[PDB]
Amino acid sequence: HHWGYGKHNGPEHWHKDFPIAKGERQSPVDIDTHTAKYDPSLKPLSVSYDQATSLRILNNGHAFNVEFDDSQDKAVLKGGPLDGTYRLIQFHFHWGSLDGQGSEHTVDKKKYAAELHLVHWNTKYGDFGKAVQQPDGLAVLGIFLKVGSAKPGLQKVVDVLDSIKTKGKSADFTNFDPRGLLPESLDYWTYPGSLTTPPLLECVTWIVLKEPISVSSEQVLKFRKLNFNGEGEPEELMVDNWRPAQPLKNRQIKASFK
Ligand SMILES: Cc1cc(=O)[nH]c(SCC(=O)c2ccc(S(N)(=O)=O)c(Cl)c2)n1
Numbered sequence: 001h002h003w004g005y006g007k008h009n010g011p012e013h014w015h016k017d018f019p020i021a022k023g024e025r026q027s028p029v030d031i032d033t034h035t036a037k038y039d040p041s042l043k044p045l046s047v048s049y050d051q052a053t054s055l056r057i058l059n060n061g062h063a064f065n066v067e068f069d070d071s072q073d074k075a076v077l078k079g080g081p082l083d084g085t086y087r088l089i090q091f092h093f094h095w096g097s098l099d100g101q102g103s104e105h106t107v108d109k110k111k112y113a114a115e116l117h118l119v120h121w122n123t124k125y126g127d128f129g130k131a132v133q134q135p136d137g138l139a140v141l142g143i144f145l146k147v148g149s150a151k152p153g154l155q156k157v158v159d160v161l162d163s164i165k166t167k168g169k170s171a172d173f174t175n176f177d178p179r180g181l182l183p184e185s186l187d188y189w190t191y192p193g194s195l196t197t198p199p200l201l202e203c204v205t206w207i208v209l210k211e212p213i214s215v216s217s218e219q220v221l222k223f224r225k226l227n228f229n230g231e232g233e234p235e236e237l238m239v240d241n242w243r244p245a246q247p248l249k250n251r252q253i254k255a256s257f258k
């Protein structure tokens with residue numbers, strides 16, 4: 001009876017195994033755009049993904065992860081609100097059963113169809129598993145997806161999903177360029193938070209881009225053909241793998257713009 005996204009093991013249950021679920025800096029949150037503080041001293045975000053080395057794509061039973069070689073400074077995030085260099089380790093998405101929901105962060109209570117998370121770890125801690133035990137260990141770049149025109153840079157991911165339909169499947173996934181998933185503008189909101197899945201550790205500097213990317217209805221439909229179950233088990237479609245907004249508590253969301 002481990003955690004997941006159903007009636008009996010979904011987000012409202014997680015606090016029984018992971019008490020930090022009711023902690024002081026949990027994510028996601030609703031981003032109230034009117035009360036976000038413009039911080040004229042936040043720097044432009046630096047996204048250096050030219051040398052990125054994707055390796056594999058994996059269905060972990062909660063989402064799919066596209067994994068990167070993080071054993072050197074190839075694909076790094078820095079600047080923005082960050083005081084350190086953070087290496088890309090993986091990205092993944094959260095999405096809905098319907099276009100009207102799917103994102104984890106919300107903007108003035110608006111849900112997007114999905115949300116991309118590019119997970120990076122602070123190089124001062126040497127690897128991901130040590131970084132998540134630190135309050136400044138991770139930087140997650142969050143990007144909203146709306147349904148409209150296709151995202152051509154997404155299509156290589158969508159086309160491999162049928163090879164990783166069920167939990168524990170993986171596939172070689174080399175030479176994927178994550179620059180093809182970024183919107184034009186790097187304007188962002190930022191606040192201190194957590195992983196949005198168990199173990200819900202409070203180790204994340206969130207950086208959420210204001211500009212969503214567009215994906216087509218057919219691209220997101222393909223995400224909804226994945227399965228939470230393993231091969232040979234009863235089919236449970238991988239939809240609605242998002243945690244709802246959590247109390248902001250004693251936190252201020254900062255904006256890099258306007
Ligand atoms: C904290 C931890 C330690 C570990 O050894 N393995 C894992 S697997 C979960 C994981 O890496 C992860 C999942 C979701 C997120 S999210 N939705 O971007 O906040 C992150 Cl940052 C990380 N997590």
Ligand SMILES: [Zn+2]
Nearest residue numbers: 092094117196
């Ligand atoms: Zn995530």
